């Protein structure tokens, strides 16, 4: 035994499953219709909505 101790620390990760309660009409989101943008390539004209 040498002349000092070792206080080791270690983190531990646990996958878990929350439950959320919230009252009626907590936040009131406002949305609009989705707009479409084009993005030209030669072969694959992607569209972002």
């Amino acid at each position: 035994h040498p002349g000092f101790a070792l206080t080791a620390v270690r983190t531990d990760t646990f996958e878990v499953d929350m439950l959320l309660y919230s009252g009626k009409s907590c936040t009131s989101v406002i949305i609009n219709n989705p707009i479409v943008t084009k993005e030209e390539r030669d072969i694959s004209t992607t569209y972002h909505v």
Partner: protein, 289 residues
């Protein structure tokens, strides 16, 4: 709304599995000798230009003055080709051996292998093999051209041993996750005439450089009016320690040896990359010609 394309047919009865083999080569670069509107399959790629007698840089020179189309769509009985224009962006599949990233300047190169390879399972015919040029980035292409130039510089005294280990040091080249090996320009202990002309023109312009400019700046020293030309002869004397029609012949020889160097002293960037697809198979890039 039909676009400006190039139609290309086939002469041989190609099967359906060959069509499925071909439709993986959508966004592949294809050279054409002359921009027609219709073209047979004997003028599609490098197998009409490949030559055992002349050297490899002749394939670059006969790739310098081409038109580099793109395969638009593979269908029955005809192959669509889309000739690019300067400014519009396209998609090129990474037919080369080396990975691409964002923003590289891309140059076109003849392939450094012909005949047997593990990745040369290209479209074959009876005598025809469609072979694509290589699309490698700019500093790698300049490195390959410089390595080939100094390896053709040692073709005369290959019999020694330190130059041998220097050559097999030179023949290997490492790039970004690509252990790369070029072939040797000396086969059966005689160099081909194209490399001989290239390095001979290089040695010619270097020898006229060592021969003429001492006399020329010694004449220009009497017409001195500045300082940037009066110490260049001084550094010439630092390193160093006829008929005038022969001098005209020396200047004209120097300039034609300059003009016989444009295949190797420079190259034009052809593509530069905007985006690269994941797993690096294709990468959408603009054209720049």
């Amino acid at each position: 709304a039909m676009e400006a394309n190039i139609f290309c047919t086939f002469d041989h009865k190609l099967s359906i599995a060959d069509v499925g083999k071909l439709t993986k080569l959508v966004a592949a670069v294809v050279p054409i000798p002359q921009r027609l509107h219709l073209i047979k399959h004997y003028q599609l790629g490098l197998h009409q230009f490949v030559d055992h007698t002349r050297g490899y840089v002749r394939l670059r020179g006969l790739l310098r003055n081409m038109t580099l189309t793109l395969m638009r769509r593979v269908e029955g009985n005809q192959i669509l080709l889309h000739v690019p224009t300067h400014g519009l962006l396209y998609t090129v599949l990474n037919t080369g051996p080396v990975t691409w990233e964002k923003g590289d300047a891309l140059c076109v190169l003849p392939p450094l292998f012909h005949g047997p390879l593990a990745r040369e399972n290209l479209l074959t015919l009876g005598q025809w093999e469609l072979v694509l040029p290589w699309i490698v980035p700019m500093p790698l292409a300049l490195e390959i051209n410089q390595r080939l130039l100094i390896m053709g510089l040692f073709s005369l005294d290959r019999s020694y041993e330190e130059v041998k280990a220097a050559v097999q040091q030179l023949q290997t080249i490492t790039f970004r996750d690509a252990t790369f090996t070029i072939p040797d320009p000396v086969i059966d202990q005689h160099l081909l005439i194209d490399m001989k002309t290239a390095c001979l023109s290089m040695s010619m312009v270097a020898n006229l450089a060592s021969e003429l400019t001492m006399t020329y700046v010694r004449k220009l020293a009497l017409e001195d009016s500045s300082m940037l030309l009066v110490k260049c002869q001084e550094l010439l004397m630092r390193l160093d320690r006829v008929s005038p029609d022969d001098e005209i012949a020396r200047l004209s020889a120097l300039f034609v040896m300059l003009r016989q160097l444009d295949d190797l002293i420079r190259e034009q960037v052809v593509f530069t990359v905007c985006d690269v697809s994941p797993d690096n198979k294709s990468a959408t890039c603009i054209f720049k010609g």
